Design a protein around this motif. Structure first.
Motif, PDB file in Angstrom:
ATOM      1  N   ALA B 193       0.846  -1.183   0.000  1.00  0.00           N
ATOM      2  CA  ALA B 193       0.000   0.000   0.000  1.00  0.00           C
ATOM      3  C   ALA B 193       0.922   1.288   0.000  1.00  0.00           C
ATOM      4  CB  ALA B 193      -1.074  -0.084   1.101  1.00  0.00           C
ATOM      5  N   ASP B 194       0.721   2.353   0.817  1.00  0.00           N
ATOM      6  CA  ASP B 194       1.584   3.523   0.781  1.00  0.00           C
ATOM      7  C   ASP B 194       2.929   3.308   1.456  1.00  0.00           C
ATOM      8  OD1 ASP B 194      -1.483   4.844   1.466  1.00  0.00           O
ATOM      9  OD2 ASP B 194      -0.527   5.231  -0.459  1.00  0.00           O
ATOM     10  N   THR B 195       2.998   2.433   2.478  1.00  0.00           N
ATOM     11  CA  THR B 195       4.249   2.156   3.203  1.00  0.00           C
ATOM     12  C   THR B 195       5.362   1.666   2.271  1.00  0.00           C
ATOM     13  OG1 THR B 195       3.157   1.772   5.285  1.00  0.00           O
ATOM     14  CG2 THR B 195       5.274   0.661   5.008  1.00  0.00           C
ATOM     15  N   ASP B 196       5.011   0.780   1.323  1.00  0.00           N
ATOM     16  CA  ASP B 196       5.982   0.246   0.389  1.00  0.00           C
ATOM     17  C   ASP B 196       6.029   0.963  -0.959  1.00  0.00           C
ATOM     18  OD1 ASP B 196       6.641  -1.568   2.394  1.00  0.00           O
ATOM     19  OD2 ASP B 196       5.937  -3.361   1.313  1.00  0.00           O
ATOM     20  N   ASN B 197       5.365   2.118  -1.116  1.00  0.00           N
ATOM     21  CA  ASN B 197       5.451   2.882  -2.376  1.00  0.00           C
ATOM     22  C   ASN B 197       6.907   3.365  -2.551  1.00  0.00           C
ATOM     23  OD1 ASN B 197       2.901   2.673  -3.540  1.00  0.00           O
ATOM     24  ND2 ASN B 197       2.239   4.757  -3.019  1.00  0.00           N
ATOM     25  N   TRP B 198       7.471   3.170  -3.762  1.00  0.00           N
ATOM     26  CA  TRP B 198       8.865   3.493  -4.087  1.00  0.00           C
ATOM     27  C   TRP B 198       9.864   2.602  -3.330  1.00  0.00           C
ATOM     28  CZ3 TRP B 198       8.556   7.037  -7.915  1.00  0.00           C
ATOM     29  CH2 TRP B 198       7.645   8.100  -7.848  1.00  0.00           C
ATOM     30  N   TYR B 303      -8.850  12.045   6.981  1.00  0.00           N
ATOM     31  CA  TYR B 303      -7.627  12.600   6.399  1.00  0.00           C
ATOM     32  C   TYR B 303      -6.602  11.594   5.861  1.00  0.00           C
ATOM     33  CZ  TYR B 303      -8.978  17.331   7.151  1.00  0.00           C
ATOM     34  OH  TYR B 303      -9.642  18.528   7.045  1.00  0.00           O
ATOM     35  N   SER B 304      -6.856  10.278   5.927  1.00  0.00           N
ATOM     36  CA  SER B 304      -5.886   9.281   5.442  1.00  0.00           C
ATOM     37  C   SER B 304      -5.523   9.406   3.976  1.00  0.00           C
ATOM     38  CB  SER B 304      -6.357   7.858   5.736  1.00  0.00           C
ATOM     39  OG  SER B 304      -6.042   7.514   7.074  1.00  0.00           O
ATOM     40  N   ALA B 305      -6.507   9.631   3.124  1.00  0.00           N
ATOM     41  CA  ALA B 305      -6.267   9.773   1.699  1.00  0.00           C
ATOM     42  C   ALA B 305      -5.519  11.090   1.404  1.00  0.00           C
ATOM     43  CB  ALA B 305      -7.570   9.704   0.928  1.00  0.00           C
ATOM     44  N   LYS B 306      -5.913  12.221   2.046  1.00  0.00           N
ATOM     45  CA  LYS B 306      -5.233  13.506   1.849  1.00  0.00           C
ATOM     46  C   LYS B 306      -3.775  13.432   2.307  1.00  0.00           C
ATOM     47  CE  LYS B 306      -9.533  15.650   3.102  1.00  0.00           C
ATOM     48  NZ  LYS B 306     -10.190  16.609   4.027  1.00  0.00           N
ATOM     49  N   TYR B 307      -3.531  12.754   3.429  1.00  0.00           N
ATOM     50  CA  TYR B 307      -2.197  12.574   3.978  1.00  0.00           C
ATOM     51  C   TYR B 307      -1.342  11.737   3.008  1.00  0.00           C
ATOM     52  CZ  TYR B 307       1.576  11.314   7.183  1.00  0.00           C
ATOM     53  OH  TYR B 307       2.810  11.139   7.766  1.00  0.00           O
ATOM     54  N   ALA B 308      -1.885  10.590   2.538  1.00  0.00           N
ATOM     55  CA  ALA B 308      -1.183   9.708   1.597  1.00  0.00           C
ATOM     56  C   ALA B 308      -0.904  10.403   0.257  1.00  0.00           C
ATOM     57  CB  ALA B 308      -1.967   8.427   1.372  1.00  0.00           C
ATOM     58  N   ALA B 309      -1.859  11.179  -0.272  1.00  0.00           N
ATOM     59  CA  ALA B 309      -1.656  11.916  -1.517  1.00  0.00           C
ATOM     60  C   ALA B 309      -0.513  12.946  -1.375  1.00  0.00           C
ATOM     61  CB  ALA B 309      -2.949  12.611  -1.951  1.00  0.00           C
ATOM     62  N   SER B 310      -0.380  13.588  -0.211  1.00  0.00           N
ATOM     63  CA  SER B 310       0.677  14.568   0.004  1.00  0.00           C
ATOM     64  C   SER B 310       2.043  13.876   0.111  1.00  0.00           C
ATOM     65  CB  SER B 310       0.397  15.391   1.258  1.00  0.00           C
ATOM     66  OG  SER B 310       1.497  16.230   1.579  1.00  0.00           O
ATOM     67  N   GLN B 311       2.087  12.702   0.755  1.00  0.00           N
ATOM     68  CA  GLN B 311       3.309  11.928   0.984  1.00  0.00           C
ATOM     69  C   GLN B 311       3.962  11.388  -0.277  1.00  0.00           C
ATOM     70  OE1 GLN B 311       5.405  10.759   3.421  1.00  0.00           O
ATOM     71  NE2 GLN B 311       4.432  11.236   5.371  1.00  0.00           N
ATOM     72  N   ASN B 312       3.177  11.009  -1.285  1.00  0.00           N
ATOM     73  CA  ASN B 312       3.727  10.417  -2.497  1.00  0.00           C
ATOM     74  C   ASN B 312       4.803  11.277  -3.197  1.00  0.00           C
ATOM     75  OD1 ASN B 312       3.152   8.933  -5.540  1.00  0.00           O
ATOM     76  ND2 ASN B 312       3.594   7.786  -3.670  1.00  0.00           N
ATOM     77  N   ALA B 313       4.503  12.542  -3.563  1.00  0.00           N
ATOM     78  CA  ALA B 313       5.513  13.409  -4.197  1.00  0.00           C
ATOM     79  C   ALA B 313       6.526  13.943  -3.178  1.00  0.00           C
ATOM     80  CB  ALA B 313       4.864  14.559  -4.961  1.00  0.00           C
ATOM     81  N   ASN B 589      -3.409  -4.254  10.357  1.00  0.00           N
ATOM     82  CA  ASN B 589      -2.854  -3.183   9.538  1.00  0.00           C
ATOM     83  C   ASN B 589      -3.351  -3.468   8.129  1.00  0.00           C
ATOM     84  OD1 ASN B 589      -1.298  -1.354   8.027  1.00  0.00           O
ATOM     85  ND2 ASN B 589       0.618  -1.880   9.050  1.00  0.00           N
ATOM     86  N   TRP B 590      -4.355  -2.701   7.656  1.00  0.00           N
ATOM     87  CA  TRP B 590      -4.999  -2.859   6.347  1.00  0.00           C
ATOM     88  C   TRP B 590      -4.035  -2.979   5.168  1.00  0.00           C
ATOM     89  CZ3 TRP B 590      -4.709   0.643   2.275  1.00  0.00           C
ATOM     90  CH2 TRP B 590      -4.125   1.878   2.571  1.00  0.00           C
ATOM     91  N   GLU B 591      -2.851  -2.365   5.279  1.00  0.00           N
ATOM     92  CA  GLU B 591      -1.851  -2.411   4.219  1.00  0.00           C
ATOM     93  C   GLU B 591      -1.180  -3.778   4.130  1.00  0.00           C
ATOM     94  OE1 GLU B 591      -0.272   2.032   3.825  1.00  0.00           O
ATOM     95  OE2 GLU B 591       0.732   0.930   5.445  1.00  0.00           O
TER      96      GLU B 591
HETATM   97  O1  LIG Z   1      -4.421   7.818  -1.701  1.00  0.00           O
HETATM   98  C1  LIG Z   1      -3.702   6.879  -1.384  1.00  0.00           C
HETATM   99  N1  LIG Z   1      -3.955   6.035  -0.330  1.00  0.00           N
HETATM  100  C2  LIG Z   1      -5.044   6.033   0.560  1.00  0.00           C
HETATM  101  C3  LIG Z   1      -6.352   6.121   0.104  1.00  0.00           C
HETATM  102  C4  LIG Z   1      -7.401   6.062   1.011  1.00  0.00           C
HETATM  103  C5  LIG Z   1      -7.150   5.885   2.355  1.00  0.00           C
HETATM  104  C6  LIG Z   1      -5.853   5.750   2.802  1.00  0.00           C
HETATM  105  C7  LIG Z   1      -4.799   5.797   1.905  1.00  0.00           C
HETATM  106  N2  LIG Z   1      -2.519   6.561  -2.002  1.00  0.00           N
HETATM  107  C8  LIG Z   1      -1.818   7.253  -3.000  1.00  0.00           C
HETATM  108  C9  LIG Z   1      -0.829   6.524  -3.647  1.00  0.00           C
HETATM  109  C10 LIG Z   1      -0.089   7.127  -4.647  1.00  0.00           C
HETATM  110  C11 LIG Z   1      -0.333   8.450  -4.948  1.00  0.00           C
HETATM  111  N3  LIG Z   1      -1.263   9.185  -4.323  1.00  0.00           N
HETATM  112  C12 LIG Z   1      -1.986   8.591  -3.362  1.00  0.00           C
END
Ligand SMILES: O=C(Nc1ccccc1)Nc1cccnc1
Ligand SMILES: O=C(Nc1ccccc1)Nc1cccnc1
Ligand SMILES: [Cl-]
Ligand SMILES: [Cl-]
Ligand SMILES: [Cl-]
Lengths: 695, 697
Positions: B193-198, B303-313, B589-591
């Motif tokens: 999931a996001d933990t192992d991205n890149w 805020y999980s999706a907003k947090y993850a979207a910010s973390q990627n770049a 842990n859902w990931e």
């Molecule tokens: O949105 C993301 N994850 C997420 C979605 C919903 C809840 C929790 C986490 N990931 C992502 C990955 C690559 C680029 N941008 C975003």
């Protein structure tokens, strides 16, 4: 795989030789002559050290000599941060309360102890493990005036294999041990807490001392007339380095192991000891870290308390990883089932009865042990106001002579130590609310310390209100509240004080639980004597080592890395390049000493770099070590010093119960890096000159 | 360095590829006048790569590429995203709206044609040489009158390469009936999931399966129940031979963008402005956000999706700056330009040195503006949610100032307010994020350069950021639902014109647009100077060891299956196994949840012919191929051109590879085809997909 007695060198020698040992048996350990064993010391009661010169120079870890470096440090000469390098013997700093112990002789006294024990009568007597009883036997054997006829010498008898083997040690103790050299903390503790239990490791964990003695080399307390000790044996330093698969061995004083735990004791260690410590410390540490990150002043006050809590937390995580993934429970179950089948064949049921007694005792004490760990982790170490002042009987029988002021001055001194420069009542209230919320959901009302019953009875289950009330009404809740008490003190105010009642109540429960649990130790100890006797009779005292008990042991293995997880390999050696990779100037743990950074840039490695021109720092080996092995000499196939043991990786902490060949490693500082730091960082050439450095 | 080569460059690379292990004939991989493996590669849904793996149009791509289609077909009754999807017959395959697959039918070098057309210059500084509109006019002129009507399904496109020094015309065949055929559960498809991205090592089974449908003659057709599976020109054979360390590997796909011809000054700008600002601002935003998510489980959900979207770049910028700091990217660009300048001096042509100078001068001149743009974009536009709060339109304000059009304007404003203050928006979290973001922004941007409303922090609030933010919410019509409803009951233009949140949003968007408009003119002199710069580089060292920047066109890359050392005493091998998945399992842990059917396969060792020689089940491998965004889903080929995996990621250590390839760190992260087939077989039980594939021993 094991931590072998010196007596077991004869039986292990052929295997050691096949693994690469080149030195003669009696050059390593000789029971009636001088050997390498005579250069190993127990450093300050809990570490290992080694003599490395004919003038009593001693190497040990930086974390072993830390208290001595700190005690000599001032704002003007901060040796802890800058290092310390005495440029002459007269400049070496004496240390109060220090000691180095040599193991002069070791004797098997099993038949003697077992014959003396036959006069007990009570079959359940615990004298067979009593230090007092065994000291009486040691004194009887050595003589009625041994230490007077042999100055500096003392005797001690210890039990091994659960009371099936006894050894008498003749020890020579020196108490004038002076600080000679230490690298800065940036080198000595490079990884600091972040790299604790971690491999790869880049820490130059060493410090240098010197044993002083009288004119005849006999032990003497500190005196300006004392002269350096000329020892009968010291280690030669090798500059040949290490390569993958090289034979390596260690001598030292491992403290404790639990190699003969039953499967039920492994389950208890996991489900009670480790799970409670993990759960409770994760709660405590989480609140503490949140507070430290939000206020830089809280970070300064709580950094040491946070780090002290994290150390055994990480150990418990590593130990539970081994229980979950390496089949520790299953291997103990197979060990005991094999003994039970062998005893059933021989017609001797006492081994099965012994395992049963251990299982039954573990099962019977479960609720009490759970309640003990819950209060100890949750409140005794979890909540600071649990260690707030409790008025003594002499202090209450003074407040109600005009020594009321004397009682108040003693209470004030203890209050001032509880509410010191590092104590935050706000941080403590937040930690207590989270810790007590967990504790109250795990401990039922009927098992609570008396004062905690007020959460349900008086505060309607509101933990926050109960904690707020303790501080709002207590005489130790603030300085102004203590001063108001100190101006008009009454024993009736102290008797009803919410904080005093909390502290008294939780300490009363902690002691009641300890006293109720203590009787369960003895049937397990007695059953272990029978259990280990059966294991030894069945498979022999050859591939099963006696549990560590702070006595001299040897272990052997090879310089080898390991794979921590799928597709990841950690090699056998780290380099100075790894130190530079980790450098972070705005992180106190990863600051790099400017002189060391310059040495790396100029490649000023001299005779210390490897064949490829890279500067080594640390290496790891398949030796079996535990706490007490810090500072242990690491030897070559020829017995030359190649490093100092200073840590073990978290993956191998389960090794105290079952050695883990594919994961467990001793973390060792390369002697080439030690010499490079003494030379290029300390500039202390005289220490290099007095050592015997071999090409 | 180790490039993304044009199909035209296969001829001149072939001998090097053969010496590195390639065994197939050149024209079996790419033939400009006939069928080749290139005909089995597709641009999947405009931003991913895919590949045809059967004579019935079956297509493999990543799970993250087919994610939207899997999600759009998922319901509470049939959650395909969570449980996977396996159509047991062709009729059960699900159609997808707004999907496409693009085949690269023909590629033709049209450089002389474009350069001749360009000579009809009205302005030497014209940017028509890079204009999609101008190049489409040239493509239409060459293809003919009504080409799209005379050749249904086909389209023509001309793209510039090498900064305008080479032009290719692509004839594309697009299919829009592409049906979902199979997908593993998300627990496999996005395991890390996001933990192992890149991250490498990687244990993610990142694949999904589609099928191209067409009319009776195999011609493109929009969705129709009469559509039949496409019989393609070419499809990949699947290899079961696996991979070993040092094996030759190659990829074809559509890498999107690279910056291989950046000057040293552009590397410095990318580090000191782009990356440092994004890192600093996102670290502030993410820190406040994580503290709020950890303290309130409801905030964590919102805020999980907003947090993850910010973390990627953010992670990408950390990886890119690590390469600039440790791999000498700036120094190697400086050496590249100095070598060209020395050669130009000897050729008697100073135009290359003049071109590098123009780029340096333009970079130096736009520094303050670019810093102000990134500061507002990262700090406020992306950083603060109430920056995207409703701004009444000119027509909405005119409607509120005598007709029923007032109630229509309020309903439109309400719709936008309800989208801003949705179920995932927390005004309390936003105020905390804004106070930290604006404190840093106000520290960097001087008063004279501030968006007009931010001047009130010093002028009206005595420098108190918290009070300024509190006042925006306390007095704004969009500060709460009750405040909006009070406005909606008695709306006035005068209330909206003085609204603190409207004024903030308007003010920061005005500044963001003013900065964008002031910065735009600086792009053109750099682009024109790059045409001269790259022409010199090509004339000097040849179009042989310097690849054209990626531009979402078909490229090939080759290398070997090889791990790497990320740091002192640590080695990451070339291959991960199913063991690694089990090591990472964490049910809470859902990931890192492991599919029970997959866990059972591992326990029983039910690996069939998919396990390696030692009986270990492979999952993923990494290779020294040069890939970037756009390469997700790319076919990975053997020395024989057989499919051995699908590219799905790249390690963070190699993200600097978009500027300079990093041989000792940069790797493509690939899902092993043996693991893909194991999941289709033992998890999906979809034997018909295995039967229609040509699996070679
Ligand atoms: O949105 C993301 N994850 C997420 C979605 C919903 C809840 C929790 C986490 N990931 C992502 C990955 C690559 C680029 N941008 C975003
Ligand atoms: O106390 C420790 N570190 C520390 C000290 C002062 C400030 C900040 C950190 N480390 C520690 C404790 C117990 C076992 N091992 C290491
Ligand atoms: Cl001695
Ligand atoms: Cl010119
Ligand atoms: Cl590299």
């Amino acid at each position: 795989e094991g931590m072998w007695l010196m007596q077991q060198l004869g039986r292990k020698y052929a295997q050691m030789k096949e693994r690469g040992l080149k030195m003669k048996e009696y050059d390593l350990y000789n029971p009636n002559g001088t050997s390498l064993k005579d250069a190993v010391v127990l450093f300050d009661g809990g570490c290992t050290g080694e003599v490395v010169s004919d003038r009593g120079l001693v190497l040990t870890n930086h974390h072993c000599g830390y208290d001595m470096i700190q005690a000599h440090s001032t704002l003007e000469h901060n040796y802890l941060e800058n290092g310390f390098w005495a440029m002459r013997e007269a400049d070496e700093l004496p240390n109060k309360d220090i000691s180095v112990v040599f193991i002069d002789k070791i004797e098997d006294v099993t038949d003697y102890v077992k014959k003396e024990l036959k006069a007990i009568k009570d079959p359940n007597s615990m004298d067979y493990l009593s230090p007092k009883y065994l000291q009486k036997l040691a004194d009887k054997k050595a003589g009625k005036n041994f230490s007077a006829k042999n100055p500096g010498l003392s005797v001690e008898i210890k039990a091994f294999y659960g009371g099936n083997l006894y050894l008498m040690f003749t020890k020579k103790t020196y108490t004038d041990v002076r600080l000679v050299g230490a690298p800065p903390s940036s080198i000595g503790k490079f990884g600091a807490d972040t790299d604790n239990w971690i491999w790869p490791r880049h820490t130059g964990d060493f410090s240098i001392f010197r044993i002083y003695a009288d004119k005849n080399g006999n032990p003497a307390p500190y005196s300006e007339d004392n002269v350096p000790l000329k020892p009968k044996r010291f280690f030669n330093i090798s500059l040949g380095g290490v390569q993958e698969n090289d034979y390596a061995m260690i001598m030292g004083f491992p403290g404790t192991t639990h190699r003969y735990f039953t499967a039920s004791e492994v389950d208890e260690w996991k489900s009670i000891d480790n799970d409670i410590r993990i759960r409770m410390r994760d709660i405590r540490q989480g609140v503490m870290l949140r507070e430290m990150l939000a206020d830089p002043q809280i970070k300064i006050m709580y950094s040491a308390k946070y780090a002290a809590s994290q150390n055994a937390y990480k150990r418990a995580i590593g130990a539970n990883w081994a229980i979950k993934t390496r089949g520790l429970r299953q291997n103990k179950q197979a060990m005991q089932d094999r003994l039970i089948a062998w005893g059933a064949k021989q017609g001797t049921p006492r081994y099965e009865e012994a395992v049963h007694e251990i299982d039954a005792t573990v099962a019977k004490r479960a609720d009490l042990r759970r309640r003990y760990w819950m209060i100890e982790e949750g409140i005794i170490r979890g909540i600071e106001f649990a260690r707030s002042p409790i008025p003594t009987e002499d202090e209450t029988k003074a407040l109600q002579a005009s020594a009321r002021k004397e009682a108040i001055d003693k209470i004030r001194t203890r209050y001032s130590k509880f509410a010191n420069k590092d104590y935050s009542a706000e941080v403590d209230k937040k930690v207590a609310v989270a810790m007590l919320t967990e504790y109250l959901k795990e401990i039922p009302y009927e098992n609570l310390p008396l004062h905690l019953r007020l959460v349900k009875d008086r505060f309607a289950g509101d933990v926050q209100a109960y904690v707020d009330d303790i501080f709002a009404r207590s005489v130790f809740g603030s300085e102004a509240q203590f001063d108001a008490f100190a101006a008009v003190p009454s024993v009736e105010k102290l008797a009803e004080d919410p904080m005093v009642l909390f502290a008294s109540s939780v300490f009363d429960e902690y002691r009641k639980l300890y006293n109720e649990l203590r009787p369960y130790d003895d049937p397990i100890l007695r059953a272990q004597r029978t259990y280990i006797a059966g294991l030894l009779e069945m498979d022999g005292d050859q591939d099963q080592f006696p549990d560590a008990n702070l006595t001299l042991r040897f272990t052997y293995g090879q310089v080898k890395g390991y794979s921590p997880r799928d597709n990841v390999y950690y090699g056998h050696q780290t380099t100075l390049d790894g130190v530079m990779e980790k450098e972070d100037p705005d992180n106190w743990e990863f600051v790099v000493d400017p002189k060391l950074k310059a040495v790396y840039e100029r490649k000023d490695f001299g005779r210390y770099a490897d064949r490829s021109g890279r500067m080594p720092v640390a290496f790891c080996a398949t030796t079996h070590t535990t706490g007490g092995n810090s500072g242990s000499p690491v030897m070559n196939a020829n017995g030359e010093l190649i490093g100092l043991n200073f840590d073990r990786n978290w993956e191998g902490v389960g090794g105290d119960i079952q050695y883990l060949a594919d994961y467990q490693r001793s973390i060792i500082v390369d002697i080439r890096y030690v010499l490079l730091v003494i030379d290029k960082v300390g500039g202390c050439q005289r220490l290099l000159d007095e050592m015997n450095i071999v090409p």
